[PDB]
A paper describes a structure:
The SARS-CoV-2 translates its genome into polyproteins that must be cleaved to release individual proteins essential for replication of the virus. Given that Mpro processes the majority of these sites, any intervention that stops this process, such as an inhibitor, would block viral growth. The crystal structures of inactive SARS-CoV-2 Mpro, with the catalytic Cys145 mutated to Ala, with 9 substrate and 6 product complexes were determined to sub-2.5 Å resolution. As in previous apo and inhibitor-bound crystal structures, Mpro crystallized as a homodimer.
Author numbering:
A (entry chain A), B (entry chain A): 1 to 305
C (entry chain B), D (entry chain B): 118 to 127
Write the structure that this text describes.
Amino acid sequence: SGFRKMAFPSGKVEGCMVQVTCGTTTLNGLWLDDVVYCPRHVICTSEDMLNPNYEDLLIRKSNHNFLVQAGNVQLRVIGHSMQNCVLKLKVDTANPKTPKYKFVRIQPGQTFSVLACYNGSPSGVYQCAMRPNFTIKGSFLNGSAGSVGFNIDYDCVSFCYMHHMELPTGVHAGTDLEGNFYGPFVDRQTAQAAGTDTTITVNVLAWLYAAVINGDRWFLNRFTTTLNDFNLVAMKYNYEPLTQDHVDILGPLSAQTGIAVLDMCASLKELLQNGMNGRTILGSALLEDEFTPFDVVRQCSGVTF
Amino acid sequence: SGFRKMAFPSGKVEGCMVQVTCGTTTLNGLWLDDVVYCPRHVICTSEDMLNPNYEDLLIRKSNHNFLVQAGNVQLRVIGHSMQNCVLKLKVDTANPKTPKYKFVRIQPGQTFSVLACYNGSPSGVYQCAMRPNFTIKGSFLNGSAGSVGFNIDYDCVSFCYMHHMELPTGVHAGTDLEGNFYGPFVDRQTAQAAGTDTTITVNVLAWLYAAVINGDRWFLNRFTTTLNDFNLVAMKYNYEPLTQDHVDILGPLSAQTGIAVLDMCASLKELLQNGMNGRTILGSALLEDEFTPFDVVRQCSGVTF
Amino acid sequence: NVATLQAENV
Amino acid sequence: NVATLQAENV
């Protein structure tokens, strides 16, 4: 029993983390095979970050301008090129700790694990979600860019995020491993705002099934609802619309607990209209929306890697 | 910016995890140098778990009764002995991935990272605290015993917990790496209850300083208090007493934000007497008590390993 | 309503 | 109140 914000084991990703220095600027890099991936603003100076033209900045640099360090060993850069917002630095040595990996781009509402790094060294690991406004509520300080978000399936590490910047509100923005930003954010130190965020409804229901699995049933009621009457209340409380595919995804958790999805939606309707009244669900006073249905099945069935 | 439940990188601990089978029972083992550590109830059968005498059960077994698997390789057991509630299985091969490690026992209110494992394979990593009643609120299923809790300092892994059992309330109990249980719990499948838990006050204040560091200041007030008047309110709300040493530990966070500890205690007093009134602190509606002062300094200063 | 020693599989 | 590119040290 028990339910926690559980992140994937970070060992496979730790072996791919390096430090990339260019001038007075340094950050973290992802070293897979003979290529090192890092955010492109490493070629920026402090005065060249308000309105930078990375095409001009990059051709102004050579291979010897990139200090790549893997622990004590300094990796020799033999090639460099830009792929959207990331830098691909070809090195003369293939990473011997390279796992089976993938470069995927995730959808809002999906989760992943972050390995926050500084100077190429891992500092911590936590779980994150891709918010509907394409931001992430992470924990990042100066020098954390180049940290990656990832999922793990069997032996394969699915890289899905690389850290870049922090928005004025404190939330963070980044790209996939091909360098394409999540959301309408550019890598300039300029005034930028994210779209208004909403609650990931299908994740809240999955988290509610996790509570039922662990003995938390005080929010359950005999009432049911239709998908249309529930969505009319979800829109009023800034929740994402529930689709039939969502009801199908929650199928396994629905059958495992014997609670229909539309029945669980009636409990969510009551929780949204009445609050919790001093109660807690899985040790939380807020409805958690950063657990996918797979996340619940993973935690409550003990899937390993 | 940002504040998350951040766990240590699990790579160093992943390389020490093995699977220990004895009869029809299997669980996880910790392999350091030429010794494998695992909970002692692996030598138990399903019918021998209500009132087991482990001294009798162990002398009834030989070295060949212990199946130790490290990945595909089956480790040859050449010695076995009991140390309180753990089993020490001497093997003919030293773990080449053995890091600099330590066996420490932590105090209630201290935190650590858990690497939940099954069949010797890591499944996830999350952060935990040693509750004042010596329980932990973890996420464990059948077959998770032998998973370890740990902290990391520089290069040294400080092992501080090994998982054993789940109490009827859903909380979990275990031992240090010398086999001595945390709290008044024994490894029998019997009716057992933990002492009433209290809130770790010094952790709540440290978490409040983390909120001030990240721009959350709505709970701050101009009022102050004395250590005695605050503790009189803390006792009414089932909080641990604040000591002068606690005020000294919170020193760094106090000076970094310019908020005296006793001034921050006045904000906690108001939050306890009035609630939050629909507000949130660091994305939470409850006062978090699973962040030590070191945890806050670690997250907000970017300490790596 | 008794404790559970969490060994075996999963 | 502008964004921050999070490189350099720490």
